[PDB]
Amino acid sequence: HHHAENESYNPEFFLYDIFLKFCLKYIDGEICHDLFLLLGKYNILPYDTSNDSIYACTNIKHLDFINPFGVAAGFDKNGVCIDSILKLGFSFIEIGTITPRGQTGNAKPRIFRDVESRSIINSCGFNNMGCDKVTENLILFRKRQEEDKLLSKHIVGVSIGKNKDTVNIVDDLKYCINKIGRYADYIAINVSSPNTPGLRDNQEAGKLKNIILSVKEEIDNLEKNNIMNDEFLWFNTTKKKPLVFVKLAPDLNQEQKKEIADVLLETNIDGMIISNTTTQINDIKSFENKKGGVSGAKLKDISTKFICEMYNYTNKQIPIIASGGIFSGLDALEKIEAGASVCQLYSCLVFNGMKSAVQIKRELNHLLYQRGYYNLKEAIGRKH
Numbered sequence: 001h002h003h004a005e006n007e008s009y010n011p012e013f014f015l016y017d018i019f020l021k022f023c024l025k026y027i028d029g030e031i032c033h034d035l036f037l038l039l040g041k042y043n044i045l046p047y048d049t050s051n052d053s054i055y056a057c058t059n060i061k062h063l064d065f066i067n068p069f070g071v072a073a074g075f076d077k078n079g080v081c082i083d084s085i086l087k088l089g090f091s092f093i094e095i096g097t098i099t100p101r102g103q104t105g106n107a108k109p110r111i112f113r114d115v116e117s118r119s120i121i122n123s124c125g126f127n128n129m130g131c132d133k134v135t136e137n138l139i140l141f142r143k144r145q146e147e148d149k150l151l152s153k154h155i156v157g158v159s160i161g162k163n164k165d166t167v168n169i170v171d172d173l174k175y176c177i178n179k180i181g182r183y184a185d186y187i188a189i190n191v192s193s194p195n196t197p198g199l200r201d202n203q204e205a206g207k208l209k210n211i212i213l214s215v216k217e218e219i220d221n222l223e224k225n226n227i228m229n230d231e232f233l234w235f236n237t238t239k240k241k242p243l244v245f246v247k248l249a250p251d252l253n254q255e256q257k258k259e260i261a262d263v264l265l266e267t268n269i270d271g272m273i274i275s276n277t278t279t280q281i282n283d284i285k286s287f288e289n290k291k292g293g294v295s296g297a298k299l300k301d302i303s304t305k306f307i308c309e310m311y312n313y314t315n316k317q318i319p320i321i322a323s324g325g326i327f328s329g330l331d332a333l334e335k336i337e338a339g340a341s342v343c344q345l346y347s348c349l350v351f352n353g354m355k356s357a358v359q360i361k362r363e364l365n366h367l368l369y370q371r372g373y374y375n376l377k378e379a380i381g382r383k384h
């Protein structure tokens, strides 16, 4: 895997795969992740030195993604590794999920990998330093961005959720908006983690509608009450108020999916993230003892079908962010042709490591060539 065919700051430098195979075999998952974050904290991760193809750029409303690959929520929960993760070759990252107060999360061990099936199962429970500290972390990023031209088009979304013991989710969502919203290019509303009791209940149509409208109202009030401030309000990439996405769980029946789509149309959500982890996977022997949501290759078909379903149920009016089992350029094109405008990676970064973005971007470009597309946007929804 000598990178020279396509030194150490190259994401495909041959030692990374060697270290990763060893880590995946012998080293606890959460310790591997700590080591990754530590390398990123000290800016010693490798970095991608390519200009991305202009023919694989994509957008959701005014968000102009330089390429179609971001890192999904839950990878940099605290926003401590934003620059270094982006510089691996990703166009955006969704930090969080954050909650108003910090939490250490559910008890360990709580994360388990299965290399054979390229799957993960987790019961993390929203481990994060809390909205106020993560807001300081994001502000530090936004200040570095302001000075580094190389980062000026990269996007940062923030996933928001509730503390375990909070009764009304809306209170926690509004708290996060008023503290971190002005530094976000978009807000992702997390009503789909399987590891916070009762959170998924908020996918019910009536509750979801009130959640979306409350979040939009709070963002709109943030603007109204602060535009005239001397310091410009939107200290983000877009220089506009954050868009609002909802992240949905794949474990829903067809009637729930249809009622949610009706709500998304009425409330004018800006995007839907399809999807979070699933609790409906049984045939992973090494996970049989274990609690939580499953990610990875065994989630691919489930979530791709879910994209097709919500694209049609929303009559193609709500942009889609794809999450679930994306590893290859083929996987990515299947999500886009199913309806997605943009892809998020998580398991691919765990199992393929530092080369994840370089490799998948290369694979997608070649496929767009072979398939005869002029650009990526032409492929969106072409399955339908």
Ligand SMILES: Cc1cc2nc3c(=O)[nH]c(=O)nc-3n(C[C@H](O)[C@H](O)[C@H](O)COP(=O)(O)O)c2cc1C
Residues within 6 Å of the ligand: 072, 073, 074, 075, 077, 096, 097, 111, 120, 121, 122, 124, 126, 159, 190, 193, 247, 275, 276, 277, 294, 295, 296, 297, 299, 323, 324, 325, 326, 344, 345, 346, 347, 348
């Ligand atoms: C350890 C772990 C923590 C996660 N934490 C979050 C989270 O905090 N918020 C969220 O919206 N999704 C979270 N996810 C889900 C991912 O963002 C992603 O939606 C999911 O893993 C499916 O994508 P993949 O198959 O590419 O891994 C987490 C996933 C894992 C494995």
Ligand SMILES: Cc1cc([C@@H](C)NC(=O)c2[nH]cc(C3(c4ccc(C(F)(F)F)nc4)CC3)c2C)n[nH]1
Residues within 6 Å of the ligand: 019, 020, 023, 024, 029, 030, 031, 032, 033, 035, 036, 074, 075, 111, 113, 120, 124, 349, 350, 351, 352, 353, 354
């Ligand atoms: C929230 C959460 C997620 C997790 C688990 C699922 N994350 C991981 O397994 C993980 N994350 C990052 C890595 C990579 C890495 C890590 C270390 C090294 C080395 F340099 F040390 F070799 N190389 C490569 C893949 C790049 C891995 C294997 N736990 N908790």
Ligand SMILES: O=C(O)c1cc(=O)[nH]c(=O)[nH]1
Residues within 6 Å of the ligand: 074, 097, 122, 123, 124, 125, 126, 127, 190, 192, 193, 194, 195, 276, 277, 293
């Ligand atoms: O923090 C977690 O446990 C978590 C959140 C989420 O949204 N999805 C997930 O799989 N885990």
